[PDB]
Design an enzyme around this catalytic site. Structure first.
Site, short mmCIF file in Angstrom:
data_model
loop_
_atom_site.label_atom_id
_atom_site.label_comp_id
_atom_site.label_asym_id
_atom_site.label_seq_id
_atom_site.Cartn_x
_atom_site.Cartn_y
_atom_site.Cartn_z
N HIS A 62 0.99 -1.07 0.15
CA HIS A 62 0.63 0.37 0.34
C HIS A 62 0.82 1.29 0.59
CE1 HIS A 62 -1.09 3.70 2.48
NE2 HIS A 62 0.08 2.78 3.54
N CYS A 63 0.36 2.56 -0.67
CA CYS A 63 1.17 3.67 -0.48
C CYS A 63 0.07 4.68 -0.91
CB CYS A 63 2.01 3.57 -1.29
SG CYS A 63 2.42 5.12 -1.68
#
EC number: 2.8.1.1
Length: 108
Positions: A62-63
């Site tokens: 995730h980012c």
């Protein structure tokens, strides 16, 4: 590998042992966190790769809340393979979709 899992489902597997890697930035960790991750921004991934702790047979990436994690999914997959890699929606987008609060610093 690369399975782009929907929210709610990820809250299930994370409460069982799946790990997540925060390939975002440490200035965001200041305010909010996510459903079970570790601070490993791109500054560590490109110099070494996945940490030996969160190296379990099933991980996630995730980012931010829309930094298109899929935009580097090829590298991210290799970085953590042979384990099973997933993408928890648009990062923070996923966790919040189900309405779950992050590990924020409680204030009044």
């Amino acid at each position: 590998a690369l399975t782009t899992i929907s929210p709610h489902d990820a809250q299930e597997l994370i409460a069982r042992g799946a790990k997540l890697i925060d390939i975002r930035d440490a200035d965001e960790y200041l305010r909010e966190h996510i459903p079970e991750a570790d601070l490993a921004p791109l500054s560590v991934l490109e110099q070494s790769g996945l940490p030996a702790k969160l190296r379990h047979e099933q991980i996630i990436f995730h980012c931010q809340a829309g930094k298109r994690t899929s935009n580097n999914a090829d590298k991210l997959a290799a970085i953590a393979a042979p384990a099973e890699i997933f993408l928890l929606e648009d990062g923070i987008d996923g966790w919040k979709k189900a309405g779950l609060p992050v590990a924020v610093n409680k204030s009044q």
